[PDB]
Amino acid sequence: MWAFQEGVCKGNLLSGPTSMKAPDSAARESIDRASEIMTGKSYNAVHTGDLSKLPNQGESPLRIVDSDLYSERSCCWVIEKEGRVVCKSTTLTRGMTSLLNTTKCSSPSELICKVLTVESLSEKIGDTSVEELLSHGRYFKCALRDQERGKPKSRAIFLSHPFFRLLSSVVETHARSVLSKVSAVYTATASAEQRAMMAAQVVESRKHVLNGDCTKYNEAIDADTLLKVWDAIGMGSIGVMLAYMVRRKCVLIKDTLVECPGGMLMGMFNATATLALQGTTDRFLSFSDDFITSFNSPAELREIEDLLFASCHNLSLKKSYISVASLEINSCTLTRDGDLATGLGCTAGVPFRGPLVTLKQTAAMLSGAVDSGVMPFHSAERLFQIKQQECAYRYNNPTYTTRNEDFLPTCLGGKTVISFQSLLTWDCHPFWYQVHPDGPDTIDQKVLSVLASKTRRRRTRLEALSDLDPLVPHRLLVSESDVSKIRAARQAHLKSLGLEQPTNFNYAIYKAVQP
C-alpha cells in the first residue's frame, strides 16, 4: 500500500523489526568491517582535510553536567575477581556511583580534576589510578539495537565504562558548542523540520541537490580523526585519553574479548565526527552522516566528492542520490521552495501498548500530522474514533477493567468515545486529561514506570529522597542523617495537612486554572 501512495511515504506505519537473536554475529561483523577498513582496502579512514579554521576552546573552564552522568540506561562496569577482568551490565547511575566509590570522589567534577592533576599515571586516586582507569575504560559490552525501521537484520550497539562516558560527555559538549558556533543551522533549539527548512534555504540558489548518506560511518571514524578534531578545538589531555582508550578498545562478545583498533563503535562521538567534515568546508549541511549539498556542474560534484573523501565521509552508493525538485534530510522531505512534500512522509503508527498510553500516543501523532498539514482535521477525527474502537476491541475485558462508569472510555468499560477536537480543547471529563498529549502521564505509564523501577538491575533498598523542597540545590551534599531528617520533616508536614502521598502536579492544568 505504501507503493501506491500519490505522495512521499517511508512506510513507517508499522513497528520496526525485532527478534531474540543474540548480538554476537552483528558485533563480530562490525568489528571485522572496522578491521578491514584499517587495512586500507575497503574504505578511507585517514583524515586529510584541514581543520585550522575551528576555534580553540582550551581556555574554557572544565565544567561537567551531573545529570547527564546518571541515568536508568545500561552501562558496563569492570571489576577484578582474581586477576581476570569481569564486565558487568549495570545502570549508568550504579556504574558512576561505583566509580566514585572506588576513586573516593564526591562528584564527577572532583574526579576529573583529580585525574587531570596527578603527577604520574601510577599515582593512586582512592583505590585506583589513572593507568587503571584507562585500562578499565577501554572495555565495551555488546547488545542488539532492534526496532530500527528499514533494518531487517539488526545492528549491534555498545555499552561503555562510566569513565569513558565522563570524558565523552566533556568532549561532546565542547564539540556541540563548536558546531553551534560554526553555523547557525547547528543551534541547540532546532527541530528536524527546522533544519530541513534551513537546508532548503541554503541550497535554493543552485540547480542539483545531492542527498547523501555515508556507508559504515562509525567504523571509518578512526581514533586519529577524533584526536585531530579534539586537538583542533583544544581538548588537550581529555582528548588524548579518549583517543588512547578508543584505539585500545575491546568488545566482549558472548564470553570472549575481541580487540577493535578501528572505528568508534556506533555513535560514541556524533558531534566530533560531524566536525570532522564541518571543520574542513562550508558547502555541506550534515548531521552525523546524513548530509545535503548543492551543485551546478559536474566539476562542483567532483569537488564535493573529493571533500567527502578527504574527511573520511565515505559516500553510500546504495542510498545517496541527486534530486532537482525535492530535498531530503533527517528523513524529512521538502520541496525546493521549503514546503513540506505532500504525502504521509515519515508518519508512524502507534502499536497497542496499553489502553490509555496508546490513545495518548495516537493523539500526539494525529496532532503532529494535522498541524503540519499532512492530513485534514476531519480525517484525524475519524482515525481517532477508529483507534478508540480498536482499543475497545483489544482491552475491554475483565483482565484490564472491572468498571462501568459512563465517562470512562469504551476500552475501560465505559460508553464514552470523545472527539479529537473535544480532547484537544480540554472539553472533556477530567479522566480524559491524561489522554491529552500535554496532559499528565496515564495510569498504565505510571504502573510500568514503578514496575521498571523494581527490576533486578534497578532495585535498591535505599530510602527514597523524593518530594524535595524546590529551593534545595541538587549539588548539595547529604548524609544518611540528612536524608532521614528531610524525609521525617516532609512526612510530618504531609500529616499536618491530611495527606499520605504528594499530589501529582501538572503545569499546564495549573496555569489554565489560574485566575
Place this chain on the structure above:
Amino acid sequence: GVVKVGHKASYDAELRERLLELPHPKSGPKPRIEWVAPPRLADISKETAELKRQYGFFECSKFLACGEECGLDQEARELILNEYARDREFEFRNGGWIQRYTVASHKPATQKILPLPASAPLARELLMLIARSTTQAGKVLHSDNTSILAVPVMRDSGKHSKRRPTASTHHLVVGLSKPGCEHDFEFDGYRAAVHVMHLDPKQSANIGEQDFVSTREIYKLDMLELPPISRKGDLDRASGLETRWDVILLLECLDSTRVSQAVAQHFNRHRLALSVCKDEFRKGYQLASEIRGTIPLSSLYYSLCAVRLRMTVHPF
C-alpha cells in the same frame, strides 16, 4: 587556578607516545562514482523473477490462510485444535498443552514463497488472538469467527524438566483454515487445515501489537487505485482480486523482520531520485541475504511485486 578543558597533564606526552606506537589506518582507495538514471521496470521484474526461480512457491498459503474463516463453529474449532494437539503427542499438564523437544537439526527450515489467499477478513481477529495467546498460552483461545492455540515449546529432560514457560520460551501458534492442502486434519467428521508458526516472544509481541484497521485506514487517505492481482502477485485484470492487497498488508504484520519497510524506503528514494549510483542503487532491492524464513521471504517478494505493479500501472 581553575582547571581548563585544554589543561595539559604530566602524562600527556607519555600517552601521545603510546598512541604513536599503536597501529594506524592505511589510506583507502578513492572510489569512482558513476551517476545514472534510476532502475527501470525491467530491473524490478528481474529481481522478482530471480527470487521466484531461486525459491519457488508453496502449494498452500500456510498460516496466511488463517485470515479466512475455516467453516467450523467454535465448538468444532476447539475440538479440532485439541485433537490436533493430542495427535502430535503434545504433553498435557494443568489443562494446557506443551510441546517437548530433545534434539535440534541445527538447519534452517525450508523457505518458499507463500501464495496469496483471496482475502483476509479476519486479520484483526488473528492479530488480536496472536497478542492474547502468547501471554495466555496453553489453551485454545476463541474470537467471534476464529480460534487459535499457543503451545509453549520447552525442553524434554526427564521427570522434572520444566512446567511453566519463562520470558524467553518460544511458542508454536496453531490456527485453522479451510481444508484442501497437505495440512488437513480430520476428527469426528470435522475437517480443517492446521497451520503452525514458531515464534519467539519478541516476534509474537511485535506481530500482536500492530493495528491492522488503523493502518489500512491511514494508507487509504492518499492512495492511488489498487489493481487486481493474482495468487502470485501479478497484474491479473481478468480474474484478479483487489482484496488480495489486504492480505499483503496482513503478511507485513506477520513478518517480524519488516523487510517491506526497507523496500519501501528504497522505493521512496527511487521515486524521489533523478540520478543514482551505477550498479549500487539497484542492489538496494536485493534483500534476500538480509532475511531468512518463509514469512520474511514472501513479504520481500510481495513488496517487490507491489513496487513492480506501481511502476506498471501508475508510472512516475
Place this chain on the structure above:
Amino acid sequence: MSQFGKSFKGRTEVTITEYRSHTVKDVHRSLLTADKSLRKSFCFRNALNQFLDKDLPLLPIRPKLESRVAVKKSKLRSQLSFRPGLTQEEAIDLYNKGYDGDSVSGALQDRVVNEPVAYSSADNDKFHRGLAALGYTLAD
C-alpha cells in the same frame, strides 16, 4: 549495616542528584512487553481501581479552549511557543500546600517548544497544539 553505607561505600557524603538517581520510578519507556506487564497480577486493573477513587477526585476542572481565529493553509514554518517557569514564591507556596516537590521544582525552568505548523492567520498568532488547522489561538 545501613543501606547508605553499602551503596556509597567509602563515602559519607553524596550529592542529592546522585542520591535521587538511585530511586527513579517515573521514567516510562514504550516496549513490546507493555501488555504482559500490565496483565501480570492485574497491576493495571488495581491501578485503575485506585485512581478512580483516590486520584480522580483531586484533579481540578480546567476550562475548555474558546478563542479561535480564521486561518488558511500556508508554507510550512516553525512556531516558537514560550512557557515561563514558576516563580520562586509560587513554587514555595505550592510546596507548602502539599504538591509533589519534584514536579514543582521541574516547572521552575523556562521552556521553549518548537512545533511545525502549516497554517496562519491575518494576525500571525500562535495556535494550541494540534489545533492550528481549526485556529485555536494561545492569545497570550
Place this chain on the structure above:
RNA sequence: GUGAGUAAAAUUUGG
C-alpha cells in the same frame, strides 16, 4: 511473593 548469586534476568538495548 521476598530476597540473594552468576561477563544476563526482561526499563532488556547504547550514543
Place this chain on the structure above:
RNA sequence: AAAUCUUUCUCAC
C-alpha cells in the same frame, strides 16, 4: 517440532 546455536538459570525464606 520450527522464522533452527534459539526455544535458557541456581540458592534461601
